[PDB]
């Protein structure tokens, strides 16, 4: 069928998709086009749908048969007045601005995408249930322990957004929203899998153990919002 | 005599096509774009345009999938893009040309390079370390004129031939043109599809110019 | 009396003539100086094909010995009785502008990489095509010997017809797929020994 | 041999038949262009009152070969020759008017 969609992202948090050209001043730069006008490349959305569908064992290989057909294009190109400076804060305990800043996209930015995919193995029947599955396990596998354990009253304007819509089609794109948003294997147990990836992570660095690892929300610059970043809403309409 | 198909293909997304791993200097670019060799400026090959064009018509006529070799395609494609049978070879009518960039000056007014490089990062397994890499595309909005030559060998088939040329271009705006297009590259759009002939004004130009101006 | 018709063949796109190291599909070249070469057989054959197809009712299906009198007298024949000597005399054409090409710090020929993506496999099986680059020029001269005063006008009209027929087609190799597009320029005629009376009319029906 | 290439080479050549449009390749062995062939022709002179016209005609014949081909598939490209170092010398016993022959042969 080649069912094309016009999906649109609205930003619940500050977002910074890599860039490569990146340097208390710490002046940063972002991915732009050749006209100096920012946009979001389609590989970010393809990685987000890789988190969505391929949440399984390590078969994410050149032998793959699903994601050669998922034809994600780029977006429309938005001017640079949709951009404010923001800060990095780690909400584990005693939340303080860490010295690692970024010039990033302003929240609630309307960006739209010409996303299409073939129907040989790919439908929205898969996308809907896979996104609800990944969202529900993003709470019940990692963030439920962050809700019940080592929780401070500063974070609870914050939207828990679980009674809102169970078919909300929510993804996570990689924008420095912790090293939990760049995962692939959460199936299907709670704490044995947690300690599994805990030694898998802690043989790559030197931290003393504590639960839970690293949750990175953000806020607004007195009005406060405690806006978690990395997540966005998607609509699915044809053409 | 012959009638040509002048036109202009533009890019609405940064397009990647071609490649080489050269001995002299790779530099800090992995998998570069195919470029013209004397004029040193980028180029859509006519081979690439023919291949993607034929694949899209193969998706159009026998719909969906084909799983078929391109010497035994549909008979109109065998007349248009050419075929080599065992001894009874059925020739081509459609000649493509190496499309090179024409609008250098209007990109030089804004101090914009002809090509585009992007830092395409890659996040691996839950160790979660970036694996940076650089690919070379050409910037969207750049224009590319083409002059496809069309030998008239059937007077009563050029209607359907130009209608499926327009059907193929219409199937090509909804697709990439080569390269790493599946993750946000390659999207094209056609404009200024004007038809002129070599000499005379025979095999009426008005109906073909209207069905390519649609 | 004999005339020489001299011009230039400039390559608008890439070109690739010929075939048959450790690489796939080389071009036919000069054997001493290794210059890329248009064989005069190829230029004569393509010109004969296009001119015989245009000096006909549309299409061309018969053998080259069975052409019209203009084509057969312009390009020669081999019959048991109706054997004719050709008036045109084509030559192998070597690459003229190595100075111009070497100024731009590019080789005279370059390697073109392109796949064949099989539809049920979606895998590349790549191949290398050598092509002499675009912007290359080829200075030619064809010897025309004059036998009929009343037919040189029609012969030169057909020669200009063959030239601008070749301007809208390719010259050898994978032509429909990008390669081969040429264009003719600096077209002139000169006399070999002893001036022809009507040379200005030939320079103006061939210089247009 | 200095340019490290053979004395004769092979050229591959088509003939595509307009019915079937298939090519039948044909190997034609040729001599490489730029090869040089040092000739000598013996002219026996038996009348002084005809030798100037005879050498005029000889130079005209060489000039007519300058704009035609020597042997083989010449209309299809091959065969084109040119005459260089055209000179006349006497076998034994010097010809008195040899300068006009060597200047209308070397023109």
Automatic annotation (TrEMBL), chain A:
GO biological process: defense response to virus
Leader sequence segment: none
Positions of the CRISPR type III-associated protein domain: 8-175
Keywords per UniProt: Antiviral defense, Plasmid, RNA-binding
Membrane-spanning residues: none
InterPro entries: CRISPR-assoc_Csm5, RAMP_III_fam
Molecular function GO labels: RNA binding
Organism superkingdom: Bacteria
Stated role: This subunit might be involved in maturation of a crRNA intermediate to its mature form.
UniProt similarity note: Belongs to the CRISPR-associated Csm5 family.
NCBIfam families according to UniProt: cas_TM1807_csm5
Name recorded for this polypeptide: CRISPR system Cms protein Csm5
Biological source species: Lactococcus lactis subsp. lactis
Lineage, top ranks: Bacteria, Bacillati, Bacillota, Bacilli, Lactobacillales
Gene: csm5
Automatic annotation (TrEMBL), chain B:
Record carries keyword DNA damage: no
Record-linked InterPro entries: CRISPR-assoc_RAMP_Csm3 (IPR013412), CRISPR_Csm3_endoribonuclease (IPR052216), RAMP_III_fam (IPR005537)
Domain CRISPR type III-associated protein per the UniProt entry, residue ranges: 8-188
Keywords assigned: Antiviral defense, Endonuclease, Hydrolase, Nuclease, Plasmid, RNA-binding
Any GO MF annotation of the entry: endonuclease activity
GO biological process, one term: defense response to virus
NCBIfam families tied to this protein: cas7_TM1809
Family under the similarity heading: Belongs to the CRISPR-associated Csm3 family.
PANTHER family listed in its UniProt record: CRISPR SYSTEM CMS ENDORIBONUCLEASE CSM3
Protein name: CRISPR system Cms endoribonuclease Csm3
Organism: Lactococcus lactis subsp. lactis
Gene: csm3
